[PDB]
């Protein structure tokens, strides 16, 4: 059916959206923008299209295998307390007279509404449930993106989704998909898995596969198959019912309502802001892509899936032969309703593959041993840092990036330096901050960063040094592009920040010792001193 239909009501912003940047970080302010509701119409047109889906034996057989692993999962209901506790403090308020504070505080109004909504889910498995549609405000750098579309139900329901399904989405995928399930990995563990399966092959080939607006390609069938996979678990008979009702009344589609309460149309594909979105997309992508691998007769495949993001590493059959089987894989994905954005291409070098917006690169530790780490073109992370350093923002990409990308040349020399300089200057190293990891919101203390890095990465991450020239280029190149100081300058700024940090002692001294040991010249020798990378909750309204 049609992915979306539109009345003509506009997608309407709730508050004023600043499209541009209000300068110690980057001179070229004008290359940095935020998407707004102004660009909705374009995104609307890219994401709205009909879906033809043609299954086959290869799909049916994979689905049957998934279902048998799923059948060995036990999962439980969460109490309202447990589900209320998972809500982020600044989650959108309900239209029925209570917000997230009340949810978090177990106010008997919020609880009693939630009981009413849970009750309605069990009595009625048919009425589509309302959703709100919103343009996202996301920052990037020039060379332009239309705002992405978020779609989400009222708070009362979000809390019900938790009761019904939090344990399924936190436990099932890793059982069904084993090592393919990407969100069970920290960065370090992810590099290790990619690198080791690269070396496990006689003659390796790998490829990323970019699905054209994945959410829109997901059909109502896809979502019901998905439901049927959850039902394989040993579930409470009430949980079994709420899940049926949630998928029929919400996951499958429903009316779309703007900030003004006008009706915008009707969704028949994935909602990006429900609890199952991450688990759904991951299971759905793993299913089709596994099917696609069989159609293409790809030998000895390893997959790594993160929502709609896919990498495959396998045995080469030769260059002609690989390219040809890649096209088959693509025809097969396209039959299953998941056609390609960029055409997918074979790569014979692990470092040249991008997945979850990252590629492996190689460097050396203090002994001179070769160490692998994940990195990326740093344009967006710097862009959003420039923004977060400028306007005030409730979420901090920079800290997330520090954590995700601690070993990188760009995160060490630029981010840590910049933000520790700012916290230092505003006497604010102590304040916990909200950042996002695999879509869950964590409150994190910057002073704890050394411990966090040693655990997610290893002591090596404070001492890496002979970075690949390709990496080094992309970095200084990005910096020229954006108008940010060259790396020589950061080294000098870091030397100073290192020093002030040490002069404060305790944990700020530890930050000085460990984080900026790269900057010194003659190095201090460094000695040693979660429930975090377990599953994906993007769009899922989660707080740990
Ligand atoms: C390990 C790893 C790799 C890529 C990622 O991409 C993201 O957008 C968010 C988190 C993340 C984590």
Numbering used by the authors: 1 to 22, 28 to 148, 154 to 539, 548 to 562
Could you share sentences copied from the article?
In this study, we presented a ligand-observed MS approach for high-throughput screen of a 384-member fragment library as well as reliable estimation of binding affinity of each fragment hit. This approach was integrated into a FBLD program targeting the RNA polymerase of Hepatitis C virus (HCV), NS5B, which is a particularly attractive target for anti-HCV drug development. Similar to other nucleotide polymerases, the domain distribution of apo HCV NS5B polymerase bears an anatomical resemblance to a right hand with subdomains representing the fingers, thumb and palm. Structural and mechanistic studies of NS5B have indicated the existence of multiple allosteric binding domains including palm I, II and III pockets and thumb I and II sites targeted by reported inhibitors. The proposed discovery pipeline combining our MS-based approach and other biophysical techniques resulted in identification and validation of ten new fragments bound to two distinctive domains of NS5B, among which five were successfully translated to X-ray structures of fragment-bound complexes valuable for structure-based design of potent inhibitors.
To characterize the binding modes of the fragments studied, they were soaked in NS5B crystals to obtain the protein complex X-ray structures. Inspection of the crystal structures indicated that fragments 114, 204, 117, and 328 all bound at the palm I allosteric domain, while fragment 162 bound at the thumb region. Fragment 117 binds at the pocket mainly through van der Waals interactions with Met414, Cys366 and Ser368, whereas fragment 328 forms van der Waals interactions with Tyr415 and Cys366. We assume these weak interactions may result in the lower binding strengths observed for the two fragments. In this study, four fragment hits and the designed ligands all bound in the palm I pocket, where an overwhelming majority of NS5B inhibitors were also found to bind Specifically, Met414, Cys366 and Tyr448 in the palm domain of NS5B have been documented to be the “hot spots” for binding of high-potency inhibitors3854 and they were also found to be the dominant sites for fragment binding in our study.
